[PDB]
Amino acid sequence: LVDRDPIKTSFEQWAKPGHFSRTIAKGPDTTTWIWNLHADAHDFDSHTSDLEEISRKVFSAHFGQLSIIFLWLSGMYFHGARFSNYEAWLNDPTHIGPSAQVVWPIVGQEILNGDVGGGFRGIQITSGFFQIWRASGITSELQLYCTAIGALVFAGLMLFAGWFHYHKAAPKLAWFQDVESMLNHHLAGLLGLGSLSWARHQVHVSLPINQFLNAGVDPKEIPLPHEFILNRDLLAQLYPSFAEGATPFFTLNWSKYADFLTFRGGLDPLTGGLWLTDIAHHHLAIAILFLIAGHMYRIKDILEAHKGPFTGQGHKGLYEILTTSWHAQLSINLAMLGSLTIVVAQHMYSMPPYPYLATDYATQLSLFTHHMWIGGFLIVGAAAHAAIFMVRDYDPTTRYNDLLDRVLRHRDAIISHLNWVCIFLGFHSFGLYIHNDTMSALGRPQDMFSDTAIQLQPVFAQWIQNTHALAPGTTAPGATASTSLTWGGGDLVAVGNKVALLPIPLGTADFLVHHIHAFTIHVTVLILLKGVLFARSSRLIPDKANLGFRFPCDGPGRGGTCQVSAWDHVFLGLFWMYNSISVVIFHFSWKMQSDVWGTINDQGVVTHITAGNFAQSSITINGWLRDFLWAQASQVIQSYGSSLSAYGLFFLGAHFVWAFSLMFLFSGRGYWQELIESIVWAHNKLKVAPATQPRALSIVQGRAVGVTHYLLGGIATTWAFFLARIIAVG
Amino acid sequence: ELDPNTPSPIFAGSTGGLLRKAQVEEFYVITWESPKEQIFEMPTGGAAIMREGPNLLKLARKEQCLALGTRLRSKYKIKYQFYRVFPSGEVQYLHPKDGVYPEKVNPGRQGVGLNMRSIGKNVSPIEVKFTGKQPYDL
Amino acid sequence: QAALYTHHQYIAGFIMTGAFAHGPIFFIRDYNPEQNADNVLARMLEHKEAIISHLSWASLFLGFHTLGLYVHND
Amino acid sequence: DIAGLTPCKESKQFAKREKQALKKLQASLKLYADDSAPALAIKATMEKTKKRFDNYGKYGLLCGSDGLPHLIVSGDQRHWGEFITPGILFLYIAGWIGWVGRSYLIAIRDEKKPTQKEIIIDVPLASSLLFRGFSWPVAAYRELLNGELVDNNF
Amino acid sequence: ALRIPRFSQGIAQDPTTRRIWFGIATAHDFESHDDITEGRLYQNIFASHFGQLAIIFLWTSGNLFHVAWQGNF
Amino acid sequence: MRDFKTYLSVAPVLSTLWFGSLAGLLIEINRFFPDALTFPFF
Amino acid sequence: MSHSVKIYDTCIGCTQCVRACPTDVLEMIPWGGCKAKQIASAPRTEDCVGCKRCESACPTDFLSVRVYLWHETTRSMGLAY
Numbered sequence A: 001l002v003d004r005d006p007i008k009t010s011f012e013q014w015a016k017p018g019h020f021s022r023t024i025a026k027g028p029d030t031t032t033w034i035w036n037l038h039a040d041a042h043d044f045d046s047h048t049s050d051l052e053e054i055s056r057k058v059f060s061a062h063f064g065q066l067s068i069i070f071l072w073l074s075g076m077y078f079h080g081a082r083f084s085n086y087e088a089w090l091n092d093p094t095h096i097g098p099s100a101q102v103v104w105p106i107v108g109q110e111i112l113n114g115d116v117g118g119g120f121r122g123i124q125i126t127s128g129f130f131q132i133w134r135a136s137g138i139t140s141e142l143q144l145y146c147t148a149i150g151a152l153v154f155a156g157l158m159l160f161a162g163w164f165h166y167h168k169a170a171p172k173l174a175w176f177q178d179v180e181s182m183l184n185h186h187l188a189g190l191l192g193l194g195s196l197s198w199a200r201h202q203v204h205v206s207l208p209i210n211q212f213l214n215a216g217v218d219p220k221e222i223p224l225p226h227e228f229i230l231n232r233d234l235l236a237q238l239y240p241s242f243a244e245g246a247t248p249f250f251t252l253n254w255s256k257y258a259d260f261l262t263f264r265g266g267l268d269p270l271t272g273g274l275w276l277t278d279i280a281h282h283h284l285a286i287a288i289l290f291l292i293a294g295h296m297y298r299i300k301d302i303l304e305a306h307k308g309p310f311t312g313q314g315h316k317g318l319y320e321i322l323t324t325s326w327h328a329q330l331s332i333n334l335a336m337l338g339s340l341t342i343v344v345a346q347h348m349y350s351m352p353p354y355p356y357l358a359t360d361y362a363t364q365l366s367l368f369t370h371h372m373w374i375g376g377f378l379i380v381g382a383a384a385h386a387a388i389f390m391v392r393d394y395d396p397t398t399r400y401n402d403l404l405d406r407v408l409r410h411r412d413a414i415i416s417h418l419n420w421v422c423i424f425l426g427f428h429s430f431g432l433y434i435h436n437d438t439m440s441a442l443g444r445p446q447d448m449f450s451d452t453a454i455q456l457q458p459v460f461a462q463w464i465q466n467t468h469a470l471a472p473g474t475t476a477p478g479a480t481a482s483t484s485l486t487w488g489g490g491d492l493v494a495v496g497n498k499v500a501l502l503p504i505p506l507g508t509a510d511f512l513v514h515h516i517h518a519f520t521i522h523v524t525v526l527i528l529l530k531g532v533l534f535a536r537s538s539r540l541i542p543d544k545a546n547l548g549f550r551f552p553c554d555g556p557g558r559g560g561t562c563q564v565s566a567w568d569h570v571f572l573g574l575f576w577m578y579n580s581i582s583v584v585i586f587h588f589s590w591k592m593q594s595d596v597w598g599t600i601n602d603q604g605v606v607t608h609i610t611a612g613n614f615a616q617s618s619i620t621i622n623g624w625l626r627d628f629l630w631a632q633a634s635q636v637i638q639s640y641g642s643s644l645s646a647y648g649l650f651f652l653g654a655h656f657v658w659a660f661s662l663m664f665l666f667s668g669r670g671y672w673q674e675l676i677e678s679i680v681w682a683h684n685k686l687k688v689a690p691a692t693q694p695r696a697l698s699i700v701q702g703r704a705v706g707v708t709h710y711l712l713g714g715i716a717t718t719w720a721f722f723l724a725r726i727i728a729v730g
Numbered sequence B: 001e002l003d004p005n006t007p008s009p010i011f012a013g014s015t016g017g018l019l020r021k022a023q024v025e026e027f028y029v030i031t032w033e034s035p036k037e038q039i040f041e042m043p044t045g046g047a048a049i050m051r052e053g054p055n056l057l058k059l060a061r062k063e064q065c066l067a068l069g070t071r072l073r074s075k076y077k078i079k080y081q082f083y084r085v086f087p088s089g090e091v092q093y094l095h096p097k098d099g100v101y102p103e104k105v106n107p108g109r110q111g112v113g114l115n116m117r118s119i120g121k122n123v124s125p126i127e128v129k130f131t132g133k134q135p136y137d138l
Numbered sequence C: 001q002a003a004l005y006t007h008h009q010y011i012a013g014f015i016m017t018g019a020f021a022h023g024p025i026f027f028i029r030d031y032n033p034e035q036n037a038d039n040v041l042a043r044m045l046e047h048k049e050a051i052i053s054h055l056s057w058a059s060l061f062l063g064f065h066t067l068g069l070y071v072h073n074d
Numbered sequence D: 001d002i003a004g005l006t007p008c009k010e011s012k013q014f015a016k017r018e019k020q021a022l023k024k025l026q027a028s029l030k031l032y033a034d035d036s037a038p039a040l041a042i043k044a045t046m047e048k049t050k051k052r053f054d055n056y057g058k059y060g061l062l063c064g065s066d067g068l069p070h071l072i073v074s075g076d077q078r079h080w081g082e083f084i085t086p087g088i089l090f091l092y093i094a095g096w097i098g099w100v101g102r103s104y105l106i107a108i109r110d111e112k113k114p115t116q117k118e119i120i121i122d123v124p125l126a127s128s129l130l131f132r133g134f135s136w137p138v139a140a141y142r143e144l145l146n147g148e149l150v151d152n153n154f
Numbered sequence E: 001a002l003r004i005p006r007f008s009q010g011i012a013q014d015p016t017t018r019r020i021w022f023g024i025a026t027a028h029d030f031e032s033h034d035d036i037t038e039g040r041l042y043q044n045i046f047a048s049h050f051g052q053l054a055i056i057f058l059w060t061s062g063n064l065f066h067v068a069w070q071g072n073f
Numbered sequence F: 001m002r003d004f005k006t007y008l009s010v011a012p013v014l015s016t017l018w019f020g021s022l023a024g025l026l027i028e029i030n031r032f033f034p035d036a037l038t039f040p041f042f
Numbered sequence G: 001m002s003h004s005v006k007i008y009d010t011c012i013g014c015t016q017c018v019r020a021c022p023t024d025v026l027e028m029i030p031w032g033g034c035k036a037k038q039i040a041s042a043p044r045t046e047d048c049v050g051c052k053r054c055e056s057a058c059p060t061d062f063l064s065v066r067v068y069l070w071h072e073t074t075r076s077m078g079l080a081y
C-alpha cells in the first residue's frame, strides 16, 4: 500500500477497496469480509510483522476504556442525583426501595415506573450506588452533580492521552521493553496512594458524617461543604487531636484510649454494613504494604534461581519473552483479575462493606452474580489468550527447553489425569442426586442420602467454620462476634427491618452441591487445559500450526477432524462455564433465602422467605424445580401489568433468543448456501441481487453466533428470573 | 535400549510418540542431514537438537514424520528421508522408490483420474444394480 | 383421548419427513436424467430455484407476522 | 355486530375493563402530590388511556367476551379500514422501499470499477432515486410487466 | 486384524469400534451392500417384512393377554 | 452543489442515524395520535 | 475409491497452486498436452488419511474431495491405536 508515501502524503486513505491480507478483499465483491473487519479487527499477525506499534496501540486503545468507564459512572452519578430518590432514601432507609431511572410516558411505557420510595414513580435498582454513596461526608443532589462532571473531566483529558499517544508519534521498545520498574510504582503509590489517599477521606469526613447519621437528622442538619478542615474540633467526637503524642512511636500514655480503628468485626445495630471505625485502619494497614512493597527492585535474578531435580530448569529463564508477549501477559492476569473477582462474590455476602446491605437483599446478589460471571467470563478468556500464545506471538523458537517444553513433554498426561478425575466426580458428583429420585420415587427414605437417612445425625458443626466464629481467643485480640457473622458460634440480633446474616449451617444439601461444583469446575478446565496445551501440534494433526488458533476444522478425514483447534476448546469451554456460574448462582439464592434471608418480629421468631425448604428437598434435583424453578418464577410469570413487568416481558424474549442459538449451533453451512441461492435466484429474476456476493456464515462465525447467543439468551433469562423474586417479598 | 546404543536425534523424555501399536503392527521412521548443532521443534510436543549420525528418528505414523518439512523445510536442507519398518522387513519402500520431491517427471505409476466417464453430466445417477458381469470394479 | 391423538400426531409428523426423505434418495441412487427428461418429473428439478423461494417467502412472511402478533400481544 | 358483540355504543364487559383495571391506577389513596409538580399517574397515563371514556372515537369495534375488541374486516356493517385502509398503506410504503431497492441498485454495475460502492452509499438513501416511489403513479404496475424488467430480462 | 461382519467388507476389517456401530445401522440398507442383486434385494425386503406382520401380532397378542385374568374387565 | 445523476457517499452505519431518527420521528406520530388500531383519514 | 474424491481440474499445473497433503499425492505425471503439462488427479492413494486440504488450494472446478472413501483402514484414520 500506498496510497503512496512513505513520506509524502498527509492525504489520508479514504477510498480504494480493501486492506487485510494481500490477495486482499480483492476488487471482486463479497460479504464475508464484513464480519471480517469487525471480528479479528484487533489481532496481530497483520498491521505489521514487527511488535513496536502494537504495544503503542494497546496502551492507547486501552485508554478509551477508562475514558468510557468515565462517561459511564457520570450517567449514574448524574442519574443517582437529579433523578433523585437518593436524598429521599437516606433520611428514610429501611423504608424506601431505591430508583435512579424513569421512563417518559411514550407509547405503552409507564407501567415500568412504579412507586419506589421518597414519593415517586420509577424503575428500581440492584446496583449498589445509593450505598457506596453512603460515604458522602457532605450529602446533596447537585453535589453528586459535581462528582459527576468531575467524571466527565477525567475523560476528554483521560481520553486525549489516547490522542497523546498512537496518533502522536509514539514512544517505542525500551519504554515498555524495559519493564524493569513497572509494578514498582503501580503497587507502591496508587495501589498504595489510593487506599492510602482513600484513608484520608475515609475518617476525615465520612466516618463522622455517618457516625452521627446512624440516629436521625435530615442532612444539612449535619455535614457542610467545608466544615472538615483545621477545625479538628468535631473530629473531637471520634477521638483526640493526639492530645500529647507526636507521630506515633512509644513514650505515649493511654489511661483511656487507642485512636479510631479500635477494631470491630461484626455489624452496626441500626446499620449492619460492618463498622467503619475499622474501615480506615484496614485500608491504612494496606497501603503501607504497597508503600513498602512497590520498592523492589530495578529482574530475572529471582526466577533465574530456584531449580531442582524434576522441578523447572527453565524456571530459570521463564521467559525473556515475558517482556515480549502480551497475549501471554494478558492471559496471565485474566486468570487472576478474573479469579480475583469472584473471590469478591463471597467476602461480600458473608461480610458486607457498605451501609444497608443484606437487609437490602436484592441490591447485593444481583452483585454476587454479576460479580461471579466476570470471575468466570474472564477466566475462559484467560485460557483463550494463552492458546493465542501457545500458537503464536514470538518470532521463532527462541524460548527453548524449559518449564514448558517440560510440561508439554508430558501432555497426553497432565490431561490423562484430570479426565478420570471428572468421571469419578459426576458419578460421585451428580448420579448422586439421581439416586434420590430413583429411590424416593421408588420411595423408601430409609436409604436416600437425606440430611438424616444416610448416617450424619443432627450436627455438621465440627470442622473449621466452628473454629472461625470462636477464634477471637487465639493470638487473636478479639472484638465481639467474629470476622463474618455467618460463622457457627454465637450472636443473633442482626437488624430491625428484615434480617441479615446468621450462622448458615451445612452437612448434606451443601455437602454435594459443593461437590457438583468440583466436577463442574474440573471438566471445565479439562477442555480448556487440553485445549491450550495441544495448541499447535498433535497425533491427530501435527501439521496443525499452519494457519491460526481458530481454523474451522482440519477436514472430514482422520475420522472426525472437526472440533480440535482451540478457538473451539474456548467455545465448548464457555458452554460449560455458563453452567459453572449458572448453577453456582442457583446455589446461593436457594440457600440464602431457604435460610438467612427471612425475618424478625417479637421473640425474633425467624421466618425465612422460605422456612428451610432446602432440608430434604434440594437433594432430589426435582426439588430444584419443585422448590426452585416452579416455586420461585411464579413471580416472573405473574409479573404482568405491574412496574417491573419488563422482566417477565424480557423472560419471554431471551428465553427465546437462547432458543434461537441452537439454530446457529446445531446446523450445517453449505446448507444456508444451498438455500441462499434459491433466494439469489428469485432475486436475479426481478434484477435485484448479485453485487456484493451474498454468502453464508463463516463456519466458525456460525459458532460465534451460537454461544454468544446461547449465553445472552440462557443468561438474561435468570437476570429476569431473579429481579422479580427479591423485589416484592424477599 | 543400551547394550546396543546407536542414537542420533536428541530428546530426553516424553509421553508423545510410539506405543503398543508399532510392534504388533507397522512402524514408520524418518531420517535426515544437517549442518551445525541446531535446536528443533518436534512432532508430539517437546523439542531438542541434531549434529548427526544417521540422524534417524523413529515415528509412530507417517503423517507425523513428514511434518519435519512442513516446518523442517523452513530451516534449510535438501535431504530428509522416511521409510517403512515392519516387525520383519519390507514391501512398501516408502521414500525409497524412484526420484523424489512430489512435482517432477520420471514415470506415472497409478492415479488415472476419470472413473469410467469424466466429470461431465453425472446427473446420470448410479447405473446398473451391481451385478457380476459389467466393468464396475474400479 | 389425549394420549392417542398424539401417538398419531407423533408418527404422522415422524412419517412425512421419511416420506420426503425417500423421495430425495430416488433422485440419487435411482433416477435417470436421460430417461425422464422434458418429462414432468424433471422440469420439477429444472425449474427448482423458484420452488424453494416461493416456499421460503411463505415462511419468512408467516414468520415475523405471527411473531409481531404475540410479542405485541405480550 | 358479527361473532363477538357490538361496539362501544354498548359492551358491558368492556365497561368493567375501563373501570377496574385502570382506575385502580387509583389504589394509592394519596401518594404525595397534594400540589406537588412531578408524579404523573395523577394526570393522564390514566386520563390519556382514560378520558378515553364512553368515547374512544367510536370506531364500531366488535369486542368479544372480556370485551377486548376483535377485528373482523370483511368490508361490511362498519369494519373496512382495519386492514385495507392500513393495508394498501403497508403496500404503498413498502414497494416504495424496494422500488428504490431495485433502484439504488440498478443504477450501478457500470462506468469504472463498481465492486462494493455499496458499503458506502453514493446518494444517501439514494437521495436522487428517492421520490421515484410517490413519483410512482401506476409505474411498476405497467413498466415492470412491459419493457425494462421485460420478459427478455426475465 | 481378522475378518467379520457378514455383509459389508470395508466395514468388515476396520480395526476401530466403528466396526460395531456402523454394523448395527447398515443392516437394513439392502440396495447396494455386498450381498445384493435386484433379485436378492426385492425378496430381501419381502421375507423381511414378512418378518413383519409377524412382530405386530406378538405385540397385539400380549396386549390382549395382560387382560383376561387381572386388569379389570 | 449537487445537481443531476447521483451524488456524494456516506459511512458504514448512517443506518444508526436512520434507525435512530427518521423511524424515531414516528413515536413522534405515535403520540400526536397517541393511539392507533384503525385510524380516521384526511 | 477406496479413496475416491475428485479434485481433478484441467491445468493440473502445480506452481503457486497446490502441494499440501500428507504423502498421498506424488503426481506430476505429464499427459501428452495440458499447458504446464502435468495432469490427472492422484498417484497410489493407499497410504494416507482424508483431508480436502487436497483442494482448499489449486482448482477442482466442480467438487473438491472430503471424506468419501467408506472402506476405511486405520492407517487411514490416525487411530488404529
Ligand code: CLA
Residues within 6 Å of the ligand: A012, A056, A057, A058, A060, A061, A063, A064, A068, A159, A160, A161, A162, A163, A166, A167
Ligand atoms: C478526532 C480524531 C481522530 C482521527 C481523525 C483519528 C484517525 C485515525 N486513527 Mg485514531 N485515535 C483517536 C482520535 C482520532 N483518530 C483517539 C482519541 C485515540 C485514542 C482514544 C485514537 C487511538 C488510535 C489507534 C490505536 C489507532 C488509531 C488509528 C487511526 C487511523 C485509523 C482510524 C480508523 O479508521 O479507526 C476507526 C475507529 C473509530 C473511528 C472509532 C474509535 C474508537 C473509540 C476511540 C471510540 C468508539 C468506542 C465506542 C464507545 C463504540 C463502542 C460502543 C458501540 C455500541 C456504539 C486514522 C488516521 C490507527 C492507525 O494508526 O492505523 C493502523 C491505530 O490503530 N487511532
Ligand code: CLA
Residues within 6 Å of the ligand: A038, A039, A040, A041, A042, A043, A044, A330, A334, A377, A378, A379, A380, A381, A382, A384, A385, A388, A567, A570, A708, A712
Ligand atoms: C483483557 C482482555 C481482553 C482483551 C484486551 C482482548 C483482546 C483481544 N481478543 Mg479476547 N477475550 C477475552 C478478553 C480480552 N480480549 C476474554 C475474557 C475472552 C473469553 C470470552 C476472550 C476470547 C477471545 C477469542 C476467542 C478471540 C479473542 C480475540 C482477541 C483479539 C481480537 C479483538 C477483536 O477484534 O474484537 C472482537 C469483538 C467483536 C468482534 C465485537 C463483537 C462482540 C459481540 C459478541 C457482542 C457480545 C454480546 C453483547 C451482550 C452484545 C451487546 C449488546 C447487544 C444485545 C445490543 C484481541 C487482541 C480473537 C483473536 O483472534 O486473537 C487475535 C479471538 O477471536 N478473544
Ligand code: CLA
Residues within 6 Å of the ligand: C014, C015, C016, C017, C018, C019, C021, C025, E024, E025, E026, E027, E028, E029, E030
Ligand atoms: C415404514 C418405513 C420405512 C421403510 C420401509 C424404510 C426403509 C429403509 N430406510 Mg427409512 N425412514 C423412514 C421409514 C422407512 N424406511 C422414516 C419414517 C424415516 C425418517 C422419518 C426414515 C429415515 C431413513 C434414513 C436416514 C435412512 C433410511 C434408510 C432406509 C433403508 C435402510 C434402513 C436403515 O438404514 O435402518 C437401519 C437402522 C437400524 C438397524 C437401527 C438404527 C436406527 C436408530 C437411528 C434408532 C432410531 C430411534 C430409536 C427408535 C430410538 C432407540 C429406542 C429407545 C427406546 C432405546 C431402507 C430402504 C437408509 C437408506 O438406505 O437411505 C439411503 C438411511 O439413509 N431411512
Ligand code: CLA
Residues within 6 Å of the ligand: A656, A659, A660, A661, A662, A663, A666, A667, A675, C056, C059, C060, C061, C062, C063, C064, C065, C067
Ligand atoms: C425459535 C427460534 C429460532 C428462530 C427465531 C428461528 C428462525 C428461523 N428459522 Mg430456525 N431453527 C431453530 C431455532 C430458530 N429458528 C432451531 C433450534 C433449529 C434446529 C436446530 C432451526 C432449524 C431451521 C431450518 C432448517 C430452517 C430454519 C429456518 C428459519 C427461518 C424460517 C423463516 C421464518 O420462520 O420467519 C422468519 C424469522 C423469524 C420469525 C424469527 C425472527 C427474525 C427477525 C424478526 C429478527 C428480529 C429483528 C430484531 C428486532 C433486530 C435484532 C437484531 C440486532 C440488531 C439486535 C427463521 C429465520 C429456515 C430458513 O432458512 O428460511 C428461509 C430453514 O432453513 N430453521
Ligand code: CLA
Residues within 6 Å of the ligand: A678, A679, A680, A682, A683, A686, A688, C053, C054, C056, C057, C060, C061, D097, D098, D099, D100, D101, D102, D103, D104, D105, D121, D123, D124, D125, D126
Ligand atoms: C432492497 C431490497 C430487497 C428486495 C427488493 C428484496 C426482495 C425480495 N427478497 Mg430479499 N433481502 C434483502 C433485500 C431485498 N430483498 C436483504 C438485505 C436481505 C438480507 C439478506 C434479504 C433476505 C431475503 C430472504 C431470506 C428471502 C428474501 C426473499 C425476497 C423475495 C421475497 C420478498 C420477501 O418476502 O422478503 C422480504 C424482504 C426481506 C426479508 C429483506 C429485508 C431487507 C430489506 C428491508 C431491504 C431494505 C432496503 C435496504 C436498506 C437497501 C438500502 C437502500 C439503498 C438504495 C440506499 C423478494 C424478491 C425471499 C425469496 O427468495 O423469495 C422470492 C427469501 O425468503 N430476501
Ligand SMILES: CC1=C(C/C=C(\C)CCC[C@H](C)CCC[C@@H](C)CCCC(C)C)C(=O)c2ccccc2C1=O
Residues within 6 Å of the ligand: A663, A664, A665, A666, A667, A668, A669, A672, A695, A696, A697, A698, A699, A701, A702, A703, F015
Ligand atoms: C441459520 C444459520 C445460517 C444462516 C444465517 C444467516 C445468513 C445470518 C446472516 C443474516 C444477515 C445478518 C442479514 C443482514 C442483512 C441486513 C443487515 C441488510 C439490511 C440492513 C438493515 C437496514 C435491515 C448460517 O449461515 C450458518 C453458518 C454456519 C453454522 C450455522 C449457521 C446457521 O445456523
Ligand code: SF4
Residues within 6 Å of the ligand: G007, G008, G009, G010, G011, G012, G013, G014, G017, G018, G038, G039, G040, G057, G058, G059, G060
Ligand atoms: S493444482 Fe490442483 S491440476 Fe491443478 S487442480 Fe489439480 S492438483 Fe494440480
Ligand code: SF4
Residues within 6 Å of the ligand: A557, G020, G021, G022, G023, G024, G025, G045, G048, G049, G050, G051, G052, G053, G054, G055, G065
Ligand atoms: S486430500 Fe486426501 S489424498 Fe489429498 S492429502 Fe488430503 S487426504 Fe491425502
